Every structure is written in structure tokens, then in C-alpha cells.
């Protein structure tokens with residue numbers, strides 16, 4: 001009945017030296033941590049230390065060239081850093097970025113290890129930079145290494161290769177990197193909910209559509225729930241969990257649940273344009289706690305309204321600690337396009353999941 005929490009101020013050192021107001025701010029993590037203390041949640045958790053991921057651990061998911069390039073940025077001059085960052089889609093780099101990405105990954109490794117050895121039941125990781133857009137061979141969308149994907153593989157490395165890991169990605173953006181890393185893998189089930197807009201929303205790829213179900217042995221093990229034409233919120237997310245996320249997850253029967261918990265679908269986010277409430281995130285967390293004997297690790301991804309992410313992530317930790325879910329508002333009828341989205345995923349995944357028939 002113990003919840004772990006990892007937070008390390010050193011991850012604030014990654015910064016944008018040319019645009020100091022860039023939304024992926026150092027204070028994202030310190031604000032979430034401060035709100036946990038304000039709400040007296042922090043002292044209810046067992047503190048798990050951060051550590052650096054090793055280069056060998058990074059190789060679980062990333063190419064040696066990509067590791068070596070990001071590693072080399074630690075010693076680069078500002079001119080090198082600016083030009084390297086511009087080689088990627090939506091990346092800024094400072095001399096501290098590599099170490100910060102290592103600490104984000106190693107923090108989650110330590111948290112997964114604590115869960116899998118029975119030291120804690122569940123855990124929350126207040127980490128940056130985020131991970132889910134990072135691919136095998138490249139950085140993207142504020143992410144250098146794929147923390148959640150690396151954690152799944154690390155979990156398998158300390159248990160058995162076939163350990164069933166569910167990754168639920170509720171960041172408003174598609175986790176293109178996580179999908180691609182596990183696209184041919186049946187041991188890691190990837191379920192993403194994301195604003196899609198027929199491919200017009202970042203990261204602007206049809207890879208995020210509902211018809212991408214995985215490849216090879218991973219056919220059926222990639223579930224994309226894409227949202228189009230609507231300011232989605234609690235009713236749509238609750239419905240997707242009831243009809244898709246939870247039935248598929250229960251049938252998969254994961255042994256560990258990782259949440260790529262971005263909070264950019266939250267009410268107030270400057271980029272997501274959605275209205276998931278803090279009580280909504282609490283209910284999503286509480287539902288996931290019914291899987292894998294409660295072995296759930298919540299990993300911060302995106303989310304850019306400092307107040308919204310602080311309240312939202314704190315409510316998730318409150319759920320991990322065993323507090324009762326706060327009451328949702330009256331769930332309005334679903335946006336018509338949300339019903340269309342859910343039906344499209346149901347038709348795409350009915351060949352693979354008997355719980356959907």
C-alpha cells in the first residue's frame with residue numbers, strides 16, 4: 001500500500017537559451033512537486049531516488065548514432081547546440097539536456113524496479129524532458145530519449161523478456177516514437193488517445209490514425225484512438241476508457257502499466273485545446289489501478305499550463321495513494337465525432353480482441 005515518487009531538481013537544468021519563455025519550462029516539474037507538498041501528498045509517498053540511465057540502457061530502444069549525437073551535445077558551444085537542435089522537429093538543446101534526459105529515464109527505471117520488486121505498489125515520476133515523440137534514431141517534439149519505452153524494456157530486463165507491459169498514453173499528442181518502437185512487438189501493448197484532426201495536429205502524421213494496428217507479431221497490439229473535430233473532455237475520455245482502453249487492457253492482462261501521462265489535454269492548456277479536468281485524470285488513473293494488481297507507474301510527458309498540470313498530476317497521485325475518486329461533473333452527451341472515432345477503433349480492433357465483439 002505504498003506509492004513511490006521520484007523528483008529531482010537537476011532535471012530543471014535543461015533549458016532554451018534563445019527562447020526562455022518556451023512552454024517546456026524547467027518549472028513544469030518544480031510546480032508539480034510544489035503542489036504535491038501543498039496538498040500534503042508528498043509526505044504520504046516513499047521517495048525514490050533519480051539516477052542516470054546508462055548508455056547500454058539507452059540502447060534498449062535507441063541507435064548508437066542517436067545516443068552519440070545527443071551525448072556529444074554536452075560539450076557543444078551555443079552555435080553547435082542551436083544548429084543541432086534545428087536538425088530536429090521542435091527541439092531545443094542546452095549543455096545540460098543530455099544529462100537531464102538520462103535522469104528522466106533512470107528515475108523511471110528506479111521506479112519500475114521498486115514496483116517490480118514489491119518495494120512500492122505504484123509510483124509517480126515527475127520528470128522532464130519528455131519522451132514519447134523520441135524515435136529509435138532521432139529526437140522530436142521536446143523529447144530526446146523515449147523514457148516510457150525504455151522503462152518497458154528495462155522492466156523486461158529485470159524480470160523476463162515476455163513481461164506484458166501496457167503503455168497508456170493520454171498526452172494530447174500521439175506518441176509516434178512509442179508506437180514505432182513497439183510496432184512489431186506483442187509484449188508491449190501501446191494504447192494512445194490523441195487529438196488527430198485528420199492528420200493536421202502535431203506530429204502531423206497519419207501513423208496516428210485508428211487503422212494502424214501494429215505489424216508482424218505486433219498486429220493488434222497498437223491501439224490509436226484519434227479525436228477529430230471537437231473540444232474533447234471528460235465525457236469522451238471516460239467513454240473511450242469504457243469501450244476501448246479497459247476491455248482491451250483487461251484482455252491483454254498486463255503485468256505492469258506505464259502511463260505516458262502528458263497533461264496537455266487538460267482544461268487551460270495553451271496547445272492542446274481540450275478540457276479534461278483534474279477529476280477526469282483521477283478517474284482515468286483509478287481505472288488503470290484495477291489492472292496488473294495495481295502495478296502502475298505514471299510518467300510525466302507534456303502539459304504546459306503550470307497550474308493545470310500541477311493540479312492534474314497531483315490528483316493522479318492522490319488516486320495512487322488510495323484516495324476515493326473526486327466526483328465528475330454531469331457527463332454531457334458525447335461529441336458526435338467522438339462516437340465516430342470510438343466506432344472506428346472498435347471496427348479496427350475487433351479482429352484482435354474478443355472483448356470488443
Ligand SMILES: CS(=O)(=O)N(Cc1ccc(C(=O)NO)cc1)Cc1cccnc1
Nearest residue numbers: 090141142171173202262264271302303
Ligand atoms: C510549441 S509548438 O507550437 O511549436 N509545437 C511543438 C510541440 C511539440 C511537442 C509537444 C508535446 O507536448 N508533445 O507530447 C508540444 C508542442 C507544435 C504544436 C502545435 C500545436 C499543437 N501541438 C503542438
Ligand SMILES: [K+]
Nearest residue numbers: 169171173193
Ligand atoms: K497520446
Ligand SMILES: [K+]
Nearest residue numbers: 182185188221
Ligand atoms: K505494440
Ligand SMILES: [Zn+2]
Nearest residue numbers: 171173264302
Ligand atoms: Zn503532448
